[PDB]
Design a protein around this ligand. Structure first.
Ligand code: CLA
Ligand code: CLA
Ligand code: CLA
Ligand code: CLA
Ligand code: CLA
Ligand code: CLA
Ligand code: CLA
Ligand code: CLA
Ligand SMILES: CC1=C(/C=C/C(C)=C/C=C/C(C)=C/C=C/C=C(C)/C=C/C=C(C)/C=C/C2=C(C)CCCC2(C)C)C(C)(C)CCC1
Ligand SMILES: CC1=C(/C=C/C(C)=C/C=C/C(C)=C/C=C/C=C(C)/C=C/C=C(C)/C=C/C2=C(C)CCCC2(C)C)C(C)(C)CCC1
Ligand code: SF4
Ligand code: SF4
Ligand code: SF4
Lengths: 80, 27, 119, 170, 731, 119, 31
């Protein structure tokens, strides 16, 4: 599975979750930022790894990094 | 220039083929 | 197919017979009361969730992940909450202590079964 | 068992016919000992008939087609030229539909009847599959090697098949 | 271990067809397997080295066997100018009738061996097919020896310990002495005992090589140091290679220069040559410590070279650690040094042709040079590719605390900016001058050209005695210090070979040398701009500093942050392979069009028509492909019909590469879905369902396979054109 | 949908696979009875030996030359796929009976077309 | 010069070895 790791630049502006078309990322209340939010990636078994998150990640350099890991049925995104 | 040495050649590289499959099925 | 692969069954309800667009392609009839939709893969289904939600109110919707042993799962919604909206029930996994700036060099991960960010 | 320097517990079995405990290069590993057995039997029988052709190369049974007695070299080329050597591949094919019936080399070997011997070709049937099997294989194995000893006598001697034995040496 | 990639469980879980392709292309990637640690790595590359060596000696026994058995080798020995060297025979069932008349050379229908092998085996002293059979068996035995060792050092208690592999200290005591020094010494033991007498007529086979000494008096009054007796009577002038007429009996005479008749180097010169190289390498074997303790600790040799000038960081303290623990650094130095050695080989096989009756067949000499140049460029690009693998998967800047390497990564911005500067300068000052000369020649006026005499190469040829320029310096001037200093030793036998215009040694030089050699330096500096770019920006750039985390050949970073097509350190390979084929392109087009002017004779055909680009596309590609592309006509065919076929074939390879290089994946990944829809939905074929799911090729593989068709198409096209061109103008 | 009607269903139904019950040796012998009779065709008129009196025999050796390769593909596909032992064509034993039926029926089709090129 | 040997070895390594070797490697994917 594509290991998505969300670092501590994540200021919780939720363009990652609103940008991800797979709901692998949610928002978690985390009292370390101004907004109190920091994203999480629990369901990385559904993670395609299209890196549409890292497009819309307005941190300094990429709080959310998508490491291309294993390739299962769902992570390959094949229709059949 | 003869024929028997060709048979001896394919014998020796047939044995060398047995060392090729012999090395091949261990790594 | 349905004999060996996971068919994703998006179920949702509406108020009026509108017309949405399939991820297969082409328009669909959109039964007004309540309707299911068997799909292939999850990006099609949540792409339909964005297809409906960015148009108008379509909520109380989620795919039951039909996997071929028979049972279902609950994708999208998961917690009666919208995923970018914050619920105080989601336990975070997938973080490290700092930025990339403290990730170890892969010559320290070399000949070990670790990752370059684990610390 | 048999070969003295303790090198003899391979994948083979001692109750198999033709056994005298000899696989130094451990070909019984990885090569399906039953199929190697059936290849040994079949090579022994067809080399056995082939050296029987190199035994009955005397004047008897020359029926109207050949006229080339005791050639043993390009006699093969003589009947490649004469035709009907393709035809005996057809006839042998018409045998090997019926004989093995599975006819694929390692995939799906027809092991049903305890012995590499097909359909029970035995119209006389005075012995069954007894230890006669044990004395078949040697009568194939010697029928293999000296068969080579005939054809190599055609290769570099090239003189005659039978005319080495009396007082004829190079 | 479960399925396929019996080595990686990250690919055995993949249901697609990627498990096959990545199962193949990561098979030899021993540093990234399931649980293969260091001892389990060196104990596998050490066995696979033996499997590799046995493949090499199986191959050379292949050449020995086909020349032994299907070639015309001793008939070629009878007339090495006249008869063409035959390769292995043909068995096509596709040659219907008219093809076979275009290949019969005697009873054989064989190919013509355009690989220079009969020349080298003819200077070795092989004058029979029998020695070729005994040699071919002599290398089947040797390949069985090497397969025995690789099978033998993967047997468990004979797998050597890693402290033996980390005896980095003493391999150089044994390679430089045993592998290089002794064997070259042993090669003089061939040349003194075989090539000198079987060149001077004496058939010294394996019988009398202990009863016939190569000098008529030898080694009982010759430990006394009367060594001028071994260079007493040279083979002066009136000799044909192979007989005993007009030849002396000295062994190690250093005349210098060529034969008068065969235009090759003297075998006395090679016997003395490998003897001196042998002695100097055996002296170099006594360099480092061992269990004895008389030598050099390598830590004391890289630690001591820290300059007190202080400019060069905290010295090389840290380099010896990152050669023992590393491998891609050691393989990068290996491919660097082997690659410069190959280019040196290529630049000397034509210039100083070593083999008798080479530079007389003008095709084998044209294939050996091009062969070792494309192999030269491949091994440089290997040295930089493993350079980038060293900087990603093998580099530790904490053991390299402000080291020379960390200093290199510090000023890599200045390195890449200045490589890009010199590459830009040469690219506006070759292409500027070729488009200037080509516009100006095109406008009815070859005179208004810019031709710059390359005076630096002309002056360097004047330093080596080429008197055809009028500089009169160290060797061209016959009264200088070096001219008197070797006046008896090797000069007058050598300046005859320099001042001659028949041989391919120190060629006459026009401004085509200028403009082309600037084009070559453009190729070297572009290709090192790429390779040094994605070898120094291999680890982290200001686009993405995460690059060291992703390994070597990761595909991309997606469209994020502007778009990230080919950011990896594998791109520098992927692009500098095009520049490799291009640069070695211009090297071998230039060499080959220089020697199609020498060998034809019209050097003015080059020097008047090579200073502009339609000189190349006219006078070289359009004209010398004429006996190629007439390889088969609607009137018939000839022996070149293979190459003229292969030529066309290779274009079909080359442009198929573009299908993978230009047009990337997501086209095909949504087209395979149409093919799998159509296969699933149809009757009579939905029974036959796949097991591995059909998936278009991933975008590292796709760029790689497009690169592979670019190479195979390129190299097969040019191997078709070298051989069909020179074999069409000659033979 | 369309091209799934009852004429399509009835015609595909009585094919030499989708029909109800045949021994897989004969079920393959019908397949090879079609294909082996077929493949003599584009080797007699267009093959390499189409000008001697081996117009017809090269059809046999070439066509059976394809047939043993095609049965080799049959045995590969039943070797890799169809791991179960449900005794039909989705098994190993039923598939190798389908392949042996294709071999004997296909060579029978080749010799049948060869002897029917006598007239 | 055993001239008949390419008529044996060139087919049995040219075509039937990349038939049975396709079988050995491709079944060897699943072994
Ligand atoms: C091609 C003919 C052939 C074949 C297939 C076999 C096969 C077999 N023999 Mg065998 N054998 C043969 C000829 C043959 N034999 C001959 C001519 C003799 C007399 C010298 C013997 C004497 C003999 C003895 C004494 C014994 C066997 C045994 C065996 C069995 C396992 C041992 C082994 O390594 O063989 C596998 C063989 C091969 C894989 C063939 C490889 C041949 C290479 C490629 C060529 C080598 C040429 C030589 C220089 C195996 C069933 C042993 C057994 O179990 O008894 C039944 C045993 O004890 N054989
Ligand atoms: C003189 C040599 C010789 C000897 C001793 C045997 C002996 C035997 N063969 Mg036999 N065989 C031989 C040559 C020989 N064969 C030749 C040359 C061929 C080829 C035509 C065959 C083809 C053959 C087949 C096809 C079968 C036998 C079988 C048998 C066994 C039982 C049949 C019998 O009583 O005889 C017996 C051990 C049968 C067997 O092994 O039992 C299952 C069997 O089915 N043989
Ligand atoms: C056990 C089986 C067997 C037997 C009985 C023979 C018997 C014979 N072989 Mg022989 N041979 C055999 C196996 C056998 N060979 C094998 C397996 C090979 C291949 C390695 C050869 C290769 C061979 C050659 C090359 C020659 C003989 C020759 C001879 C004859 C010379 C007589 C003598 O002893 O001196 C003799 C009839 C010689 C002959 O007949 O011509 C002079 C001869 O030149 N053989
Ligand atoms: C670098 C070491 C080296 C290498 C590569 C060779 C290579 C060769 N030698 Mg050789 N040779 C060497 C050292 C070497 N020699 C030394 C040190 C001696 C002196 C004892 C000889 C004495 C020697 C003789 C006497 C002959 C060869 C021959 C040959 C050729 C065939 C050998 C064969 O069949 O096996 C082959 C090219 C044979 C040859 O060239 O055939 C004419 C041959 O007759 N060599
Ligand atoms: C004297 C002892 C000795 C000798 C002869 C060797 C020899 C070898 N070792 Mg070795 N080794 C030794 C001691 C020795 N070792 C010791 C003591 C250790 C432990 C400290 C090791 C540890 C060791 C390791 C760990 C490895 C080797 C390997 C090798 C092989 C190198 C690959 C090769 O063939 O390149 C041959 C190269 C040449 C002949 C020269 C190439 C470059 C020259 C300049 C160009 C050629 C010259 C000329 C111009 C061209 C002639 C061609 C002709 C057509 C004209 C080679 C066979 C490697 C291998 O492959 O495993 C087998 C390997 O991985 N060794
Ligand atoms: C490693 C290579 C090698 C080997 C094994 C030999 C081996 C031999 N040489 Mg020798 N030799 C060599 C290189 C070699 N030489 C070189 C490079 C030269 C030139 C300096 C000579 C010059 C030479 C002379 C002049 C004589 C020998 C002789 C001999 C033989 C007795 C000592 C012995 C077979 C003596 C002999 O009988 O020649 C065969 C003899 O008189 N050699
Ligand atoms: C002795 C020299 C040597 C050695 C040991 C290595 C060793 C290695 N290289 Mg390598 N390399 C070398 C030379 C060498 N290289 C050279 C000279 C180049 C420049 C051309 C490269 C370029 C290179 C790249 C770009 C990469 C490596 C990688 C690797 C590692 C894994 C290789 C692997 O799994 O391939 C598996 C085996 C194959 C893929 C088979 C090769 C088939 C190639 C791709 C095409 C050949 C097909 C052929 C032309 C078709 C024939 C048809 C006919 C018409 C011509 C391994 C440590 C990889 C790595 O470390 O990254 C993780 C990597 O990405 N190397
Ligand atoms: C015809 C093919 C061609 C040409 C000319 C070039 C040229 C160049 N490549 Mg290149 N390249 C090519 C194919 C080509 N490539 C291919 C197929 C690949 C594989 C994808 C690459 C991969 C590649 C890499 C990876 C790199 C280059 C780089 C460079 C530049 C090298 C520095 C230099 O020489 O600058 C001199 C400049 C020129 C030769 C440009 C031509 C001069 C023009 C035509 C004149 C200006 C315009 C003119 C007035 C016309 C006006 C147009 C009109 C509409 C108004 C140079 C621009 C490198 C770079 O950026 O270097 C700094 C670099 O890193 N190339
Ligand atoms: C990336 C990388 C790398 C790289 C690679 C390579 C590729 C390199 C380069 C290098 C090279 C590729 C080499 C070259 C060298 C140089 C030289 C070497 C030059 C010089 C010259 C000279 C020296 C000459 C001169 C002379 C003459 C002319 C005569 C007289 C004398 C003399 C000799 C002086 C490495 C591994 C390192 C590291 C890691 C990373
Ligand atoms: C164009 C067209 C079409 C098509 C065609 C077809 C369909 C054909 C085919 C045909 C075929 C394809 C045929 C087949 C034939 C066969 C048969 C009818 C049978 C016979 C029999 C057999 C073959 C036998 C064999 C054998 C032998 C000989 C010996 C022994 C063994 C066996 C028994 C096996 C249709 C009609 C649709 C429609 C219209 C148009
Ligand atoms: S990381 Fe970038 S994207 Fe993910 S939440 Fe914080 S800000 Fe929004
Ligand atoms: S990885 Fe691809 S899918 Fe998973 S979140 Fe980042 S972008 Fe959306
Ligand atoms: S194209 Fe595909 S690969 Fe190239 S950059 Fe855009 S996303 Fe990354």
């Amino acid at each position: 599975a594509h290991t998505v790791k969300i670092y501590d630049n994540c200021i919780g502006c939720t363009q990652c979750v609103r940008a991800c078309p797979l709901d692998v990322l949610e928002m978690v209340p985390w009292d370390g930022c101004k907004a109190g939010q920091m994203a999480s990636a629990p369901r990385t078994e559904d993670c395609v790894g299209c890196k549409r998150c890292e497009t819309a990640c307005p941190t300094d350099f990429l709080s959310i990094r998508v490491y291309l890991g294993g390739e299962t049925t769902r992570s390959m995104g094949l229709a059949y | 220039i003869t024929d028997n040495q060709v048979f001896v050649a394919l014998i020796m590289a047939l044995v060398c083929g047995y060392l090729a499959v012999k090395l091949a099925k261990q790594l | 197919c349905a004999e060996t692969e996971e068919k994703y069954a998006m179920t949702w309800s509406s108020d009026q017979q509108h017309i949405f667009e399939m991820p297969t392609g082409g328009a669909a009839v959109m039964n007004s009361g309540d309707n299911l939709l068997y799909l292939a893969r999850k990006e099609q289904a949540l792409a339909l969730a964005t297809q409906l939600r960015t148009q108008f109110k379509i909520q109380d919707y989620k795919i039951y992940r039909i996997f071929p042993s028979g049972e279902v799962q609950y994708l999208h919604p998961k917690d009666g909450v919208l995923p970018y909206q914050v619920n105080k029930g989601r336990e975070q996994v997938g973080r490290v202590k700092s930025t990339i700036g403290k990730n170890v060099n892969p010559a320290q991960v070399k000949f070990t079964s670790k990752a370059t960010y684990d610390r | 068992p048999a070969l003295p320097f303790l090198s003899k517990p391979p994948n083979l079995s001692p109750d198999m016919p033709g056994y005298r405990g000899f696989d130094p290069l451990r070909f019984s590993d990885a090569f399906d000992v039953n199929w190697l057995q059936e290849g040994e039997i079949k090579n022994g029988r067809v080399a056995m008939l082939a050296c029987l052709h190199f035994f009955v190369t005397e004047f008897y049974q020359f029926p109207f087609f050949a006229g080339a007695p005791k050639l043993a070299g390009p006699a093969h080329d003589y009947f490649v030229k004469s035709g009907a050597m393709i035809q005996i591949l057809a006839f042998i094919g018409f045998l090997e539909f019926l004989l093995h019936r599975g006819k694929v080399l390692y995939s799906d070997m027809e092991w049903k009847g305890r012995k590499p011997g097909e359909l029970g070709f035995n119209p006389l049937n005075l012995p069954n599959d007894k230890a006669m099997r044990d004395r078949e294989v040697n009568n194939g194995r010697l029928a293999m090697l000296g068969f080579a000893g005939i054809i190599h006598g055609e290769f570099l001697n090239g003189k005659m098949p039978f005319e080495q034995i009396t007082n004829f040496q190079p | 271990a479960t399925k396929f990639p019996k080595f990686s469980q990250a690919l055995a879980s993949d249901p697609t067809t990627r498990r096959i392709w990545y199962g193949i292309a990561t098979a030899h990637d021993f540093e990234s397997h399931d649980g293969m640690t260091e001892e389990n790595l060196y104990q596998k590359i050490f066995a696979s080295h033996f499997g590799h060596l046995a493949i090499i000696f199986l191959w050379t026994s292949g050449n020995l066997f086909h020349v032994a058995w299907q070639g015309n080798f001793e008939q070629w020995v009878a007339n090495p100018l006249k008869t063409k060297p035959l390769a292995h025979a043909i068995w096509d069932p596709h040659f219907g009738q008219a093809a076979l008349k275009a290949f019969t050379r005697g009873d054989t229908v064989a190919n013509i061996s355009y690989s220079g092998v009969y020349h080298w085996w003819y200077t070795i002293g092989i004058r029979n097919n029998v020695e070729l059979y005994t040699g071919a068996l002599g290398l089947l035995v040797l390949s069985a020896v090497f397969l025995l060792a690789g099978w033998l050092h993967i047997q468990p208690k004979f797998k050597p310990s890693l402290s033996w592999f980390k005896n980095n200290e003493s391999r150089l005591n044994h390679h430089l002495a045993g592998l290089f020094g002794v064997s070259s010494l042993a090669w003089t033991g061939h040349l003194v005992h075989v090539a000198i007498p079987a060149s001077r007529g004496q058939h010294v086979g394996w019988d009398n090589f202990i009863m016939t000494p190569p000098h008529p008096a030898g080694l009982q009054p010759f430990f006394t140091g009367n060594w001028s007796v071994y260079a007493q009577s040279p083979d002066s002038m009136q000799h044909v290679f192979g007989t005993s007429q007009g030849a002396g009996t000295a062994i190690l005479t250093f005349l210098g220069g060529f034969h008068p008749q065969t235009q090759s180097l003297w075998l006395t010169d090679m016997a003395h040559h490998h003897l001196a190289i042998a002695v100097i390498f055996i002296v170099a074997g006594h360099m480092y410590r061992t269990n004895f303790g008389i030598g050099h600790n390598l830590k004391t040799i890289l630690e001591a070279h820290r300059p007190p000038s202080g400019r060069l960081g905290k010295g090389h303290i840290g380099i010896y650690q990152t050669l023992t623990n590393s491998l891609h650094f050691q393989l990068g130095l290996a491919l660097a040094s082997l690659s410069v050695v190959t280019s040196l080989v290529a630049q000397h096989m034509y210039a100083m042709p070593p083999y008798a009756y080479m530079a007389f067949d003008y095709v084998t000499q044209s294939a050996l040079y091009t062969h070792h140049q494309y192999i030269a460029g491949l091994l440089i690009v290997g040295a930089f590719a493993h350079g980038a693998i060293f900087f990603i998967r093998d580099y530790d800047p904490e053991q390299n605390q402000d080291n020379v390497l960390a200093r290199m990564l510090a000023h890599k911005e200045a390195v890449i900016s200045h490589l890009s500067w010199v590459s830009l300068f040469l690219g506006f000052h070759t292409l500027g001058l070729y488009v200037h000369n080509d516009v100006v020649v095109a406008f009815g006026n070859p005179e208004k050209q810019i031709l710059i005499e390359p005076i630096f190469a002309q002056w360097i040829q004047a330093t080596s005695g080429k008197m055809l320029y009028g500089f009169q310096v160290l060797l061209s001037s016959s009264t200088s210090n070096a001219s008197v200093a070797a006046q008896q030793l090797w000069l007058p036998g050598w300046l005859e070979a320099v001042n001659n215009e028949s041989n391919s040694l120190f060629l006459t030089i026009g401004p085509g040398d200028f403009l082309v050699h600037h084009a070559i330096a453009l190729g070297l500096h572009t290709t090192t701009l790429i390779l040094v770019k994605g070898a120094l920006d291999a680890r982290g750039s200001k686009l993405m500093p995460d690059k060291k985390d992703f390994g070597y050949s990761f595909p991309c970073d997606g469209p994020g942050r502007g778009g990230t097509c080919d950011i990896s350190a594998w791109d520098a390979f992927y692009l500098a392979m095009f520049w490799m084929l291009n640069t070695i392109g211009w090297v071998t087009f230039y060499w080959h069009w220089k020697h199609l002017s020498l060998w034809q004779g019209n050097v003015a055909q080059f020097n008047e028509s090579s200073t502009y680009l339609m000189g190349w596309l006219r006078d070289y590609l359009w004209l010398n492909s004429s006996p190629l592309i007439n390889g088969y006509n609607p009137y018939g065919m000839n022996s070149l019909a293979v190459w003229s076929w292969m030529f066309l074939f290779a274009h079909l390879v080359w442009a198929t590469g573009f299908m993978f290089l230009i047009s990337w994946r997501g086209y095909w990944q949504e087209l395979i879905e149409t093919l799998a829809w159509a296969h699933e939905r149809t009757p009579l074929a939905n029974l036959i369902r796949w097991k591995d799911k059909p998936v278009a090729l991933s975008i590292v593989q796709a760029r790689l396979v497009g690169l592979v068709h670019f190479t195979v198409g390129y190299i097969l096209t040019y191997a078709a054109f070298v051989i069909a061109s020179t074999a069409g103008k000659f033979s | 949908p369309i091209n799934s009607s009852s004429l399509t269903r009835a015609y595909l139904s009585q094919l030499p696979i989708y029909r109800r019950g045949v021994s897989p040796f004969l079920r393959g012998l019908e397949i090879g009875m079609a294909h082996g009779y077929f493949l003599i065709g584009p080797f007699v008129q267009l093959g390499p030996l189409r000008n001697t009196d081996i117009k017809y025999l090269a059809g046999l050796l070439s066509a059976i030359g394809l047939i043993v390769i095609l049965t080799l593909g049959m045995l590969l596909y039943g070797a890799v796929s169809f791991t179960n032992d449900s005794q039909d064509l989705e098994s190993v034993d039923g598939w190798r009976q389908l392949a042996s039926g294709f071999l004997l029926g296909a060579v029978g089709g080749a010799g049948f077309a060869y002897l029917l090129l006598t007239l | 010069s055993a001239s008949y040997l390419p008529s044996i070895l060139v087919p049995t390594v040219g075509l039937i070895l990349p038939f049975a070797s396709m079988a050995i490697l491709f079944i060897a994917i699943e072994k």
